[PDB]
Write a protein that binds this DNA or RNA. Sequence first.
DNA 1: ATTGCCGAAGACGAAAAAA
DNA 2: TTTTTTTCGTCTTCGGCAAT
Length: 468
Amino acid sequence: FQLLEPYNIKANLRPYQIKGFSWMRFMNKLGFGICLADDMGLGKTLQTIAVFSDAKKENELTPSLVICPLSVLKNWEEELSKFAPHLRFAVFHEDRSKIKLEDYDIILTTYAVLLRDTRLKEVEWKYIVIDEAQNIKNPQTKIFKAVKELKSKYRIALTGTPIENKVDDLWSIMTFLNPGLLGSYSEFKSKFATPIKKGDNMAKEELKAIISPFILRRTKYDKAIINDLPDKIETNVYCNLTPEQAAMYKAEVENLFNNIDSVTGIKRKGMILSTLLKLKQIVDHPALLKGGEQSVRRSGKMIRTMEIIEEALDEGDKIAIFTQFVDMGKIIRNIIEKELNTEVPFLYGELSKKERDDIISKFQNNPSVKFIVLSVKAGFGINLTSANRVIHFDRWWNPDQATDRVYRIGQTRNVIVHKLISVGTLEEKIDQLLAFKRSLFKDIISSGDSWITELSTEELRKVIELSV
DNA sequence: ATTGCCGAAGACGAAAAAA
DNA sequence: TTTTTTTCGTCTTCGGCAAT
C-alpha cells in the first residue's frame, strides 16, 4: 500500500480523500472491485476523479464509463471539468448518435440509457463507476442484468448508505464488483440472508468478513474526519421543471418579449421585474400563482427537497429551509408535515419577537422537531446553531458568510448547505454570471437584481428564457 | 409474521403529432 | 427533412389484501 499523490487534480484533497482515493486505486491495480461508501458530504465524486486522473497517467483510463442518476448528471459534468480540466469527457444522453465513444477518456450515462443502448453494452472499458449503486439492489431488476453484462478492467461502486447492514442490497453491488465472491443470489440468500435475517451472528460475522475488505466507509462524525471537513459544505442541487411549470415559464417568458419592445425607460425595468418575479415563483411551485392542490409532484424543487430530507433524516440531522416567499414558506411546511407526518415550525417576519424565539427554542430543544422553515430577508436575530443541514429553496439572499453569521450557521457544528437551482431556468444562467466573475461581476450585482433590468433585450433573452 | 398477486404511481425515454 | 410539444410505454417500487 502507499498514499498516491493527487495527479493534476485542480483542488486540495483532505487527508481522508487522499487515503480513500489511494486505497481505491491500490485495489484496482491489484485487480479488485471496491465500493466507496462515505457519507454524501465527504466527496466521493472528487476522490473518484483523483482515481481517474491517476489511472490516466498510468494509461489505464481511456475509455471509462460512469453510470449515474439523472439527478446528478451535471454534477459530474461540473466536477469533472473543474477538478480535472485535463480529462476529456462526453455526456451520453441525447443525440447519442453524434457521439463516438472511444474518442473520450470518460463517458457519463444514465441507468435509464443503459437499458436502451447497445453501443455501451459492447465496449472494452478500463473503468466503470456505478454512482449511487443502490440502483442495483434487486438483481431481479433489468438494470442489474444490463450492468453485469458490461466489460470492465476496473470497477467502483459508489453509495451513500451503509451496505454492511442491508443484507439484501449487498449481493448485487458486491457481485458486480467481484463476480462470485458470494455465489448466486439464490445460494447467497440461503447461507447468509434468511440465516442472518432469522437472527444469526455466525452468519453476519462471516459474511461481513468476506466483504469488509472491499467496502470502505467513513461517516461525517468519524473522529478521524469531523475536524478536517470544512464547517460549511455547499453543493448545488439541480432541479427539473414539471411539464406544468415549464408551460407557465415558457408562457411568461414569451410574453415579456412581446411587450418589452413596446416600452422603455422606467416601465421597461418594472415590466422585466414582475415578469422576473412571476418566474421566480413558477420555479418554486405553481400553486403560488394558480392556487390549487399544494402537491410535491407539481414542483421540481419539492421533488428534490424531499429526496434530500430523506437522506438528512437518515442521520438525525436538523434541517433548515430558507425561502424568499412567505407563501412558499407555508406550502413547504405543509407538504413536509403531511408527508413525513412530523412537526414543522415556520418562522417569518410578521411573527412577534416572542413568537420567533418560541420557535427557535422548539427547534434546538425538542428531540422530535427535526425541521424548521424560514421566510425572512437578512437583519434579525435567528439562532440556528442546531442546524447541520441547510436548504436554500430559492435564491433569497442579497448577493454570504456574513449572511450565514447573521444566523449562527457554521458556528457550532459542521453543516451541509444544499442550494437548489432549476436547470435551464434563469436560476442556472444567473450563476453562469456570478461564477462568470467576481472582479467585474459582483459590484453592481449587489444592487439587488436591478442590474438585470438594464441588460439588453437580446442578452436578457438568453438569460431568462428557458434553455434545454 | 411471511409471500405474492394486483393496482397505482412515479420516473424517463422514445415514439407520435403538429401552430 | 427540421423542430418542438404531447402523448405513449416500459420498468420498477410500494401500498394494500388475501392466503399460508
